[PDB]
Design a binder for this molecule. Structure first.
Ligand code: MG
Ligand code: MG
Lengths: 130, 134, 131, 130
């Protein structure tokens, strides 16, 4: 059920948002930065599964993974910022290298400056769809 | 030597994980800090099993397709002692997407603190010794 | 006009499905022919709901995201009468990866022959009349 | 469980192989060609899910779709003909057009001439891994 996936996406995003707000109030420790990255990862995993579950509900069983799901979501208007959602997939592919502080800082910057807003917009869109 | 350069990166990663583990031994971690400990586990484990894959490729074994194969061959050859613990690490890796549930995050953290950190350190010392002698 | 080009291909697809459906009324299909009937249902259904999407888009509706949306709007606007049958089509589409199981292949084939074929034929007449 | 997925892949492939041998015996009807295409669809869907399940079993939960499962299988030596498997994905993307006889014939040709032998090699490799 795509609505159950959406409810879990909402929960995960709530945790990500608490971390983003914290980072707004003060600098994050190195450990907290790693945690923000992990929350981004479980929120994005939920998001593209919401996409795939929703298109399955619509009758599209051809979508396989996150790139398929993101491309169909952009094509059908579930997301507007196709570029940012593609960048998220690239960021996920960098996860194993965040023990380098430059990589961690770059991913954190993208999460705060771009991904959180896009996650919130996708939540609002999918909630409006049911 | 490829496996030795990987090991240098593994050692760096593990130093970061160890900082977080000893802090966790000191006080409760926040939810966000637990997520960070899990992330550090993930990059440390990824490096560890690739050290093993590199090492066994250097030794002539090209039948390692992932962390399970690498762990099995390492336990077969004695690079690791605690087979069950290293297998459980793979289960923990596969739970990463569910750590927005507090019970899942708490269980991975518990396993990192009680078992995985020790195994990571033992494996580092083992491979450091293998730079010098069988 | 995009939707009429889609309709023209839908007609060609439905003609091929009809051949197989009328053959199945004649005799048992081989296991392979059953798979072929399912494939023709797949390409005929895919054209059908994209005809609906293209048509409503040509009337100014850009809110259709998939075959379920397209079916609902077609029912609301009278392009189909058998809303529940068209809804079952979507369930059938979502099962085609499992037609290596005979229970699944036979269920889909039965629905194609007993229900979907006539629904496809009605939709053809409706949209050719709007053409 | 990747072993259960492999068992289902073996059953699906057995049906595809029956169709390929029948084609060796005599020309296929248009409907029978459509059936060979459907068998290719359910066999390939199972195959790339066998890859994904196996890498999950290995501890890699980053694979999401058919493309990255296929790339990872080539990288880890599970398949030797990476480009044929990538072509398989493109053929999947064309199956909605097999109401045109030219498309149907091209896909059938690739199934008989290339995909079947690759499917069999992958089955043998994965069964060897047990
Ligand atoms: Mg992570
Ligand atoms: Mg098909």
């Amino acid at each position: 059920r795509w609505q159950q996936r959406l409810n879990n996406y909402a929960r995960a995003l709530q945790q990500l948002s608490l971390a983003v707000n914290l980072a707004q109030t003060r600098p994050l420790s190195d450990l907290e930065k790693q945690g923000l990255i992990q929350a981004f990862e479980f929120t994005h995993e939920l998001a593209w599964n919401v996409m795939k579950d929703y298109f399955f509900f619509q009758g599209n069983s051809a979508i396989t993974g996150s790139r398929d799901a993101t491309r169909e979501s952009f094509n059908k208007g579930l997301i507007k910022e196709g570029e940012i959602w593609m960048e998220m997939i690239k960021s996920r592919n960098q996860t194993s290298h965040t023990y380098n502080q430059s990589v961690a800082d770059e991913i954190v910057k993208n999460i705060i400056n771009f991904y959180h807003t896009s996650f919130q917009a996708f939540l609002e869109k999918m909630q409006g769809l049911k």
